[PDB]
């Protein structure tokens, strides 16, 4: 009876694709065909943050738009003051292989994890005056690839065991577990209202999840290879994905399908990181060619290149006030562009 | 300096953090790191008599070896973490002919990986005693799995250990030559393979790793100064 289930799945997919095609009246290229180009978008490196020993995998901006946290395989997190280029905190880790780090929106905690399948929460503000491990969340069966805070007592994680999870930090237990991906989940992006979030995995698939119920609302396909980075458009009705396909794609939640693609014939390397500007007009994406490209999201036209690193651009971020862009690379350097 | 007193104290704190980072820099740059690969039944667990991590010491040089085993079958993504390591130590069971082609394919995949294009490989052909016993017994035949064994002759530079049979030497050097011919097709001089014959009782493995790491460092330094 397996063939019956398979044919039911195929029929359902055919119904989904025809229902989707019933809405493609026009494309974003035609809708935004009469828009003035943004023009030459040139940025310069204002700060260069030096001090890490090995490749940097993760970074995260603070809500104040001034303090940021970065993670290196030497076994250290560093909190940098961007304005003064000062080191505020240097946190040694118990495991050298760290792949992600997050900064709490309140600013009282940081998180990290990696090949040790553990998510560590460090309390930044203690009476003793030093950073100490606040909690050690265990339960994933694969490397922790991403983590994002909701508040001081909730965190969402994605792992290499093809699942995501929502935790209660006080009890150290998984309040919810999100399953459905058939490959390693690489990145996740929380909604501005902290109600929904997407995950992209190494199966050319992105999934939209509701945190309160714990079910996959919609599934987006269209890539040809592993998705490495994912990020919402500011209003929350669209998101952008980058992959080893060497193409970025824009998906809209309401239309349940992609609207625009971003690629060039010269580009043959995959996208490691992706982010949006404050207004969503620019899409910033870092590649394996040691460069970041700026795309006119509404026109799919490249508008500029950030070329200052000498190795793979591993992490990228944009401040909450949209005033600066931070790019961290495998050459052990993190740069601020404005 | 157009700085407030608290700004100056923050600067001083950052300076102390930098001093600690410099000390950690010396400590970190002193130690060699190795990645241990090889399927099960190969005996990679017991190669050094000194399991996610392991420390050992050889003549005032520190080696730190990592065996990643608590993950899934797919290794396409996390393997990228190990692209700064000095060496990948690949262990292959040399007695089982039923799973040797899998070892060859794995070694090929590691050798040609984009993020492992500069890492050298120390190859340990483990379990030589079992291979010798199986060869002298005659029950198993390499020709069944590798037809090229018939049209093979022992190398001119092959060394026989004192007391042995030529068939055993032929088998050993055929096994070594398979990995070697895999290794001499895309290396381009950027990275090399160091094959060794080791049994279970062998205790020289650490010294071989030490010498191989010395050679790897010398080649890397020559290339960096653009002399080779």
């Amino acid at each position, epitope marked *: 009876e397996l063939d019956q289930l398979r044919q039911e799945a195929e029929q359902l997919k055919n119904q989904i694709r025809d229902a989707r095609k019933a809405c493609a009246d026009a494309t974003l290229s035609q809708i935004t065909n009469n828009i003035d180009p943004v023009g030459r978008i040139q940025m310069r490196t204002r700060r260069t943050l030096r001090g890490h020993l090995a490749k940097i995998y993760a970074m995260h901006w603070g809500t104040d738009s001034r303090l940021l946290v970065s993670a290196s395989q030497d076994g250290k997190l560093i909190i940098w003051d961007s304005y003064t280029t000062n080191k505020v905190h240097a946190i040694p880790l118990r495991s050298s292989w760290v792949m992600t780090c997050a900064y709490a929106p309140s600013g009282n905690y940081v998180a990290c994890g990696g090949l040790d399948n553990i998510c560590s929460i460090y309390n930044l503000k203690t009476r003793e005056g030093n950073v100490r491990v606040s909690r050690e969340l265990a339960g994933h069966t694969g490397y922790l690839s991403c983590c994002r805070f909701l508040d001081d007592n909730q965190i969402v994680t994605s792992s290499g065991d093809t699942t995501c999870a929502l935790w209660d930090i006080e009890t150290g237990q998984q309040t919810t577990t999100f399953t459905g991906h058939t*490959g390693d989940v690489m990145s996740l992006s929380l909604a501005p209202d902290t109600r929904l979030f997407v995950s992209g995995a190494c199966d050319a698939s992105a999934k939209l999840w509701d945190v309160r119920e714990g079910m996959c609302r919609q599934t987006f396909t*269209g890539h*040809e290879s592993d998705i490495n980075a994912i990020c919402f458009f500011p209003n929350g009705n669209a998101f952008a994905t980058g992959s080893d396909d060497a193409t970025c794609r824009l998906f809209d939640l309401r239309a349940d399908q992609e609207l625009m693609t971003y690629s060039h014939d010269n580009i043959i390397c*995959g996208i490691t990181s992706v982010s949006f500007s404050k207004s969503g007009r620019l899409l910033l994406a870092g590649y394996d060619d040691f460069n970041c490209n700026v795309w006119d999201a509404l026109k799919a036209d490249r508008a500029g290149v950030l070329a200052g690193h000498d190795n793979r651009v591993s992490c990228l971020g944009v401040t909450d006030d949209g005033m600066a862009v931070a790019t961290g690379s495998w050459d052990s350097f993190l740069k601020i562009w404005n | 300096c157009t700085l407030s007193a608290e700004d100056k104290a923050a600067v001083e704190r950052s300076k102390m953090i930098e001093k600690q980072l410099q000390k950690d820099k010396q400590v970190y740059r002193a130690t060699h790191r190795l990645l241990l690969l090889g399927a099960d039944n190969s005996g990679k667990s017991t190669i050094v008599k000194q399991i996610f991590e392991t420390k050992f010491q050889v003549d005032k040089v520190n080696f730190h070896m990592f065996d990643v085993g608590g993950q899934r079958d797919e290794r*396409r993504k996390w393997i990228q973490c190990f692209n700064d390591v000095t060496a990948i130590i690949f262990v292959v069971d040399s007695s089982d002919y039923n799973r040797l082609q*899998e070892a060859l394919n794995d070694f090929k*995949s590691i050798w040609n990986n984009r993020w492992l294009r500069t890492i050298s490989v120390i190859l340990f052909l483990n379990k030589q005693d079992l291979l010798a016993e199986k060869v002298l017994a005659g029950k198993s035949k390499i020709e069944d799995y590798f037809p090229e064994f018939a049209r093979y002759t022992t190398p001119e530079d092959a060394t026989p250990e004192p007391g042995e049979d030529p068939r055993v030497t032929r088998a050993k050097y055929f096994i070594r030559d398979e990995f070697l011919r895999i290794s001499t097709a895309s290396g381009d001089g950027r990275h090399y393979c160091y094959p060794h014959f080791t049994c279970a009782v062998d205790t020289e493995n650490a010294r071989r790793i030490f010498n191989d790491c010395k050679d790897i460092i010398l080649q890397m330094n020559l290339r960096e100064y653009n002399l080779v």
Partner: nanobody, 126 residues
Framework: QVQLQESGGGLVQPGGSLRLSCAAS????????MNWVRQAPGKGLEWVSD????????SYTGSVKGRFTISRDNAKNTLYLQMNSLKPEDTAVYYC?????????????????????RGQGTQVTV
């Protein structure tokens, strides 16, 4: 969506021949290296053959050397495997696997238990 569909399997007497086909959709077929893998009862996945993008590079496993041949038509976006002189041990489920990333020679995780870019397979009995 990445789709790979295998066809051309069944029961054949020893010494016969059989042609397997793999139709690919949802990606640029000419940009990827392709593989043929099999799984026998009571045994795990075993790499069988592979062919590169332009088809210049072709490699086989030992047991199939000379008996089998692999080919690809990029215009038709299809992969072909011809199987001659079928030994009784050739009985297995055959999969057409696609390498994870384009413009690469290394192909990780093609004989893995759960690989996304694979197919349902065809049973070949000898």
């Amino acid at each position: 969506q990445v789709q790979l569909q295998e066809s051309g399997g069944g029961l054949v007497q020893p010494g016969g021949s059989l042609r397997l086909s793999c139709a690919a959709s949802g990606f640029t077929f000419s940009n990827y290296k392709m593989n043929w893998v099999r799984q026998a009862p009571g045994k795990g996945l075993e790499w069988v053959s592979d062919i590169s993008q332009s088809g210049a590079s072709i490699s086989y496993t030992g047991s199939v050397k000379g008996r089998f041949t692999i080919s690809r038509d990029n215009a038709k976006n299809t992969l072909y495997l011809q199987m001659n002189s079928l030994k009784p041990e050739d009985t297995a489920v055959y999969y057409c696997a696609r390498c994870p990333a384009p413009f690469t020679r290394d192909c990780f995780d093609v004989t893995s238990t759960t690989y996304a870019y694979r197919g349902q397979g065809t049973q070949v009995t000898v």
